[PDB]
Amino acid sequence: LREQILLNGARKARLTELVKERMAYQEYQTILEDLDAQVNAAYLKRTRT
Amino acid sequence: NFPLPERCSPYDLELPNSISREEFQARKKRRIEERREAAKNAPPPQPKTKPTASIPACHEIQGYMPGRLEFETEYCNEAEEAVQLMSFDPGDGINPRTGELEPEMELKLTVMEIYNNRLTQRVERKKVIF
């Protein structure tokens, strides 16, 4: 048991290094998409009219 | 002699003289009559069964095509709604005066860049699922 806990902690320790960087990408994407909708939705009106 | 046959030379006249015309004609009449007799006695052709539709939906998930590796309802299947009425001005693409893309063109291309990114996001989702 003491042999396995350390391995699990090491594995979970590494994942926390990869999760944090992926969270930042989410915030950058969630604002980029909003701009994409406006620029995309701000041209359809030209076709409509 | 790819563009031609091998016996392009008119001087070679062996095959014409190797069999007489009457003999060769006799064979033609013989093959014709038996073939006609075979056709008359031939069995009727079986009716064409229904065309073997490919039906790529074989996989045990409705709306998946293992042969094509493409789903029917993708991640953002509504991403085409923004460019399926798109049209372009003939013969344009560059401003004659300034040399830069005219304002409408640079806007039209920008709304195509988003669609390309949408396609790439789909592929990554498919890659993980495989």
Neighbours of B115 (CB within 10 A): 16
- Nearest-angstrom CA–CA distance, B67 and B57: 9
Write down the H helix ranges in B1-130: 14-18, 21-41, 103-129
**Nearest residue of A to residue B107 by CA position?**
A43
Tokens (6 digits) for B126? 């498919």
- Method underlying the structure: cryo-EM
- Nearest-angstrom CA–CA distance, B14 and B75: 73
In which element (H, E) is residue A3 found? helix A2-48
- Chain A positions touching B110 (Cβ under 8 A) are 39
Coil vs helix vs strand at B71: strand
Quick check: B82 and A39 CB within 8 A?
no
Chain A to chain B Cβ contacts (< 8 Å):
14
Mention every residue, 6+ apart, whose C-beta is less than 8 A from residue B57.
B63, B64, B65
Quick check: B114 and A36 CB within 8 A?
yes
- Chain A positions touching B82 (Cβ under 8 A) are 40, 44
Tokens (6 digits) for B106? 């640079």
DSSP B65: E
Helical packing angle, A2-48 and B103-129, nearest 10°: 150
Coil vs helix vs strand at B64: strand
Tokens (6 digits) for A38? 């406006």
Q: Which of B82, B110, B114 sits opposite A44 (nearest CB)?
A: B82
**Nearest residue of B to residue A36 by CA position?**
B114
Tokens (6 digits) for B37? 């007799």
Residue B64 C-alpha, separation from nearest chain A C-alpha, in angstroms? 28
